[PDB]
Design an enzyme around this catalytic site. Sequence first.
Site, PDB file in Angstrom:
ATOM      1  CG  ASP A   8      39.668  42.241  39.143  1.00 29.96           C
ATOM      2  OD1 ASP A   8      40.481  41.996  38.219  1.00 29.96           O
ATOM      3  OD2 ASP A   8      39.567  41.512  40.154  1.00 29.96           O
TER       4      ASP A   8
ATOM      5  CG  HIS B 140      42.634  39.388  40.118  1.00 32.36           C
ATOM      6  ND1 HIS B 140      41.269  39.512  40.259  1.00 32.36           N
ATOM      7  CD2 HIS B 140      42.913  38.075  40.302  1.00 32.36           C
ATOM      8  CE1 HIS B 140      40.744  38.328  40.520  1.00 32.36           C
ATOM      9  NE2 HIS B 140      41.719  37.436  40.549  1.00 32.36           N
TER      10      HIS B 140
ATOM     11  CB  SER C 241      39.398  34.745  40.573  1.00 30.47           C
ATOM     12  OG  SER C 241      38.832  34.891  41.876  1.00 30.47           O
ATOM     13  N   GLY C 242      37.865  35.226  37.781  1.00 22.50           N
ATOM     14  CA  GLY C 242      37.826  35.504  36.344  1.00 22.50           C
ATOM     15  C   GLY C 242      36.678  34.816  35.618  1.00 22.50           C
TER      16      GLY C 242
ATOM     17  N   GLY D 185      41.285  29.989  42.046  1.00 20.70           N
ATOM     18  CA  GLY D 185      41.226  29.223  40.792  1.00 20.70           C
ATOM     19  C   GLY D 185      39.915  29.422  40.042  1.00 20.70           C
TER      20      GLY D 185
HETATM   21  C1  LIG Z   1      39.232  34.021  42.983  1.00 21.65           C
HETATM   22  O1  LIG Z   1      40.158  33.226  42.835  1.00 21.65           O
HETATM   23  C2  LIG Z   1      38.518  34.104  44.304  1.00 21.65           C
HETATM   24  C3  LIG Z   1      37.297  34.774  44.420  1.00 21.65           C
HETATM   25  C4  LIG Z   1      36.656  34.833  45.661  1.00 21.65           C
HETATM   26  C5  LIG Z   1      37.225  34.222  46.790  1.00 21.65           C
HETATM   27  N1  LIG Z   1      36.633  34.261  48.014  1.00 21.65           N
HETATM   28  C6  LIG Z   1      35.313  34.184  48.230  1.00 21.65           C
HETATM   29  N2  LIG Z   1      34.510  33.837  47.314  1.00 21.65           N
HETATM   30  N3  LIG Z   1      34.823  34.471  49.441  1.00 21.65           N
HETATM   31  C7  LIG Z   1      38.442  33.561  46.668  1.00 21.65           C
HETATM   32  C8  LIG Z   1      39.083  33.495  45.429  1.00 21.65           C
END
Ligand SMILES: *C(=O)c1ccc(NC(=N)N)cc1
Length: 245
Positions: A90, A41, A194-195, A192
Amino acid sequence: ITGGSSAVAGQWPWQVSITYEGVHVCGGSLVSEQWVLSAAHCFPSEHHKEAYEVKLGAHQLDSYSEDAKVSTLKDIIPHPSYLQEGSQGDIALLQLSRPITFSRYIRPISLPAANASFPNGLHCTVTGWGHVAPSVSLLTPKPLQQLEVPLISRETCNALYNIDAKPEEPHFVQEDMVCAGYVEGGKDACQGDSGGPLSCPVEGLWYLTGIVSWGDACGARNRPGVYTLASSYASWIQSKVTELQ
Ligand SMILES: *C(=O)c1ccc(NC(=N)N)cc1
């Protein structure tokens, strides 16, 4: 990362920053000399491959470092099963334009086998340069943040996400996913992050158990972070990387 703390420089040498048009958008994990694992994503189809960079060996993002290295990408390979936000698959393999040299600050993380099990309640660590609270950026010079999180099964996680849930929203933790965090708020991965890696300790080493996928507002109660299991893609990763080695 909300509720975490600053890592020490080089503590998580597989952690990379992924940028689009010069702006940090996602984390990732170095897995060999030329390959990084991240979330699919983070790479929408309309984005241009030439606009991406990967920064390795960094601690403070805004600070200059002779140890940091920056690369562009030769290829971006999302898993074919990935469709929309929240779906399975993902995960994306990123091939650097050129191979890099490992250093004390730049090292690959071991990948788990398909049948690797990481037990419920295992204390793993999630890292990133993402937000430190909902809609609050990590302050310059942006030192890498870390957070210990226990593993939470997808079944318990789904039950948690069902509490006070928005009807129109899927928040379904898929078969290729796991959670990690706390039933109460406060401590979680954020936008930020994520990944990036969920690193778990096994037999003296660290494995890439999870890739930060999705969740609600970061640090909200009953909304621990959701991760793609690297074990679910072991065979695919090995196949792709070997064919293209
Ligand atoms: C990625 O940017 C991401 C992953 C997970 C969340 N939310 C939680 N960890 N609850 C936001 C953003």
